[PDB]
Design a protein around this ligand. Structure first.
Ligand SMILES: [Cl-]
Ligand SMILES: [Cl-]
Ligand SMILES: [Cl-]
Ligand SMILES: [Cl-]
Ligand SMILES: [Cl-]
Ligand SMILES: [Cl-]
Lengths: 16, 16, 16, 16, 16, 16
């Protein structure tokens, strides 16, 4: 799995 | 587009 | 341009 | 000291 | 567990 | 001071 920080603003995290 | 930081280590960025 | 994450708290993003 | 970004969501920062 | 980005430089990630 | 993560790639950090 990847660790992911993403935003378009708040930064949200996800582990996919 | 969304700004993305990702890693499996080095953190890398992308703009998608 | 640069991608920037910054904070003094919430992390905010910018593309400059 | 180390710079730290952490989350369980909102990403938060710390300088320890 | 927490998702963690940390640095003293390279940013490294960890999931604790 | 601000904590800054930035990149044009590797993510680098600064405290200003
Ligand atoms: Cl916001
Ligand atoms: Cl590495
Ligand atoms: Cl605060
Ligand atoms: Cl939230
Ligand atoms: Cl380095
Ligand atoms: Cl490159």
């Amino acid at each position: 799995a990847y660790l992911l920080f993403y935003t378009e603003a708040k930064v949200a995290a996800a582990v996919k």
